[PDB]
Structure 1
Amino acid sequence: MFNSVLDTIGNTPLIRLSKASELTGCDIYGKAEFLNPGQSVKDRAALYIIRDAEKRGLLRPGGVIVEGTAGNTGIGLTMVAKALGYRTAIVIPETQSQEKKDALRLLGAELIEVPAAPYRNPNNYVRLSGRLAEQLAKTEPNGAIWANQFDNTVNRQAHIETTAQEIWRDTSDQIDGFVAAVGSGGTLAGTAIGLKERNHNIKIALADPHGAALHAFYTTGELKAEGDSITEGIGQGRITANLEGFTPDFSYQIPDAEALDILFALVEEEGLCLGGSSGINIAGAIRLAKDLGPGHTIVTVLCDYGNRYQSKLFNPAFLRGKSLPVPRWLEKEIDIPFE
């Protein structure tokens, strides 16, 4: 018996990744964040951000949550917002697909379409969404907040208090390592805080895609983001406020091909069809398990479903255009017994 969809956020199960476990002589588990009602890991941050703004009086019923995202954050924020009586203004580049605009719109998000741009530009959708929030605060009686996922540390706080404690509880205190990729850094940094408080010997690893700066920074102190990735929701170019004070014990740079191989074999072999960040994360978990050696328990995050990436990540034509692997089963008939 639960009072709203909000009580179904979190307490997600750990699923044993069988091929990754067999390969490493470790128990490697993936946290099923896809089983949140918003269908991603962002339900946690979305809940914490909105609850924080409520607690601080910055939102009243009918108020607006502004965020720049395209965008599990948008989905999570809009679901939570509609459950609590708020609205969302999701700032999105106009050049983003009609597919992603429709998933957000379906849930009642009000899209603000703007020209695409890089982070250095003040009209970049992330940065623009902050100034929009400050503007709307004057003409919205019930308030207007910037969710500010990247630099709002209640994001990290969500994983300290929920994710980490669930992992500690569900591994019966036996977790030896945790690995995750970084967008905002809330998941990795927050879960790291939570876990290391329980047992300071737990090892934390970053799993970084090509095109992100964090691997280079943590390993050599260099400032470089070579290459790129088709993965979405991850790949960070600065030390966000959620990343402040955080140092990983290990760091891995995972190419797209290694992530996609894992991801495609997971569908055929384990019935899990997940997003690109899950490919990166599982690859990181395998590497962490190899570094710690056999007889250890590794946990990572299965952040969302692969259905949302179907038109690129599981699209043969797009993948071949990127010189990346293709799902074996999509290329591949029977005589149908009509009459």
Structure 2
Amino acid sequence: QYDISFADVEKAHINIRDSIHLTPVLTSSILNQLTGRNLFFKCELFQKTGSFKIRGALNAVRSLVPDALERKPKAVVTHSSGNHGQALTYAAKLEGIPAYIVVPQTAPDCKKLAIQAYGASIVYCEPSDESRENVAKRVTEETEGIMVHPNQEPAVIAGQGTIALEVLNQVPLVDALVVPVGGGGMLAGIAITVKALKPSVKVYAAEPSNADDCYQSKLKGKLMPNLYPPETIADGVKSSIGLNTWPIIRDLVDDIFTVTEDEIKCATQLVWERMKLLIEPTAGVGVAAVLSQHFQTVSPEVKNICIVLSGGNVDLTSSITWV
């Protein structure tokens, strides 16, 4: 049916469990006091590499093949330099294979240094897609490597779904999961998992209003990517949903809540100040959603809500500016 099944998610859990953390679910009286709800916070900001993306990246390194004629990847390649590049590099290090990140000439110095700092090799391209594509294909082919897309690769979607296996096991009375959405790898893997195991539990997406392709796609009933690169402080969710995650999100996600930049900022600061968790602002999206006016339409029967705090990779010096 879909590009992954619950079986694939369990295969992914089996494949990655020896190398990830079973991150805690934390609670807060203060957030429970404010929102009306009984909240549970799945702390992927404490995951290895600082975000959940190690789940899909390690599943892809451990299950994908480079070629018909070679079962073992000899390198990994991606155009994504943030949380996905960091996680894919850590996964490749664990398996003893090199990682290459394809980076435009125009990337900021800090971005080049930091990819270097996380242990990958940089391969330069022109800021064009013809170039970026030529370059990554050439690298993938010459290194006998796997190209691992941050959100549309089935093995990555399946890995990110393992978050929901842990949540359901850790919070047996959970009523809904709230998941920030960018490309929808995490949303789709979670939705497959929850709807296969306990479809009475709601799956809600949380998205910046400034980057609201998932909401507009669910509204229209077809995939409507952002027409222009979005501007948002939620840097980790600027990708649009894509062809492999959209059908899952269309059919298996219950609702989508959009939040403004101010709402993301206020929720992020609230978590820092009152929960003492260094989430990145992208992980404040789901918190904003549950605090938002529209979330008041969620039935009072939906009491036990687990919000995924998806990452903690924040640049500290320069992130006090908006607070």
TM-score, normalised to structure 1, is 0.79
1:95 is paired with a residue of what secondary structure? coil
> For residue 302 of structure 1, what is the aligned residue in structure 2?
309
Mapped partners of 1:219, 1:150: distance in 2? 21
1:245 is paired with a residue of what secondary structure? helix
Mapped partners of 1:156, 1:195: distance in 2? 14
Give CA deviations for 1:97-132 in whole Å, capped at 9, x if unaligned: 333322321232011233435xxx433x4xx2xx44
Mapped partners of 2:175, 2:276: distance in 1? 26
Identify the range of structure 1 (30-39 vs 74-83) with the bigger mean alpha-carbon deviation: 30-39
> For residue 286 of structure 2, what is the aligned residue in structure 1?
281
Change (3 A) 1:166 1:96: same
Mapped partners of 2:247, 2:197: distance in 1? 20
Instruction: Give the CA deviation at 1:136.
Output: 3.3
Mapped partners of 1:231, 1:304: distance in 2? 11
> For residue 49 of structure 1, what is the aligned residue in structure 2?
60
Q: Tell me which amino acid in the other structure corresponds to 1:269.
A: R
> For residue 249 of structure 2, what is the aligned residue in structure 1?
246
Give CA deviations for 1:291-331 in whole Å, capped at 9, x if unaligned: 1326611112112215x33355x142xxxxxxxxx32xxxx
Give CA deviations for 1:151-178 in whole Å, capped at 9, x if unaligned: 2111111133x21110110002x11111
Q: Tell me which amino acid in the other structure corresponds to 1:281.
A: G
- From 246, 262, 265, the equivalent of 1:260 is 265
Q: Is this contact kept in 2: 1:214–1:236, CA < 8 A?
A: no
Mapped partners of 2:135, 2:126: distance in 1? 15
> For residue 166 of structure 2, what is the aligned residue in structure 1?
166
2:215 is paired with a residue of what secondary structure? helix
Equivalent pairs: percent with the same residue? 22
> For residue 107 of structure 2, what is the aligned residue in structure 1?
96
Give CA deviations for 1:26-50 in whole Å, capped at 9, x if unaligned: 2112211121221111110111110
> For residue 204 of structure 2, what is the aligned residue in structure 1?
205
Instruction: Give the CA deviation at 1:224.
Output: 7.0
Mapped partners of 1:67, 1:197: distance in 2? 30
Change (3 A) 1:184 1:211: closer
Mapped partners of 1:107, 1:283: distance in 2? 30
Q: Is this contact kept in 1: 2:157–2:185, CA < 8 A?
A: yes
RMSD over aligned CA atoms reads 2.7
Instruction: Give the CA deviation at 1:196.
Output: 1.5
Mapped partners of 1:59, 1:224: distance in 2? 34
Mapped partners of 2:276, 2:50: distance in 1? 17
> For residue 130 of structure 2, what is the aligned residue in structure 1?
122
Instruction: Give the CA deviation at 1:53.
Output: 2.0
1:319-334 alignment, distance < 5 Å: 326-327=322-323
Change (3 A) 1:85 1:201: same
Instruction: Give the CA deviation at 1:258.
Output: 0.5
Number of aligned residue pairs: 299
1:83-232 alignment, distance < 5 Å: 83-117=94-128, 121-123=129-131, 125=132, 128=133, 131-140=134-143, 143-160=144-161, 162-172=162-172, 174-209=173-208, 210-221=210-221, 223=224, 225=226, 228-232=231-235
Mapped partners of 1:122, 1:138: distance in 2? 16
Instruction: Give the CA deviation at 1:137.
Output: 4.8
Instruction: Give the CA deviation at 1:246.
Output: 2.2
Give CA deviations for 1:259-314 in whole Å, capped at 9, x if unaligned: 111111222222112111111111123348631326611112112215x33355x1
Q: Tell me which amino acid in the other structure corresponds to 1:217.
A: S
Mapped partners of 1:303, 1:229: distance in 2? 17
Change (3 A) 1:42 1:77: same
Q: Tell me which amino acid in the other structure corresponds to 2:197.
A: R
Q: Is this contact kept in 1: 2:183–2:240, CA < 8 A?
A: no
Q: Is this contact kept in 1: 2:77–2:148, CA < 8 A?
A: yes
- From 236, 239, 255, the equivalent of 1:236 is 239
Change (3 A) 1:134 1:94: closer
1:148 is paired with a residue of what secondary structure? coil
Instruction: Give the CA deviation at 1:8.
Output: 4.0
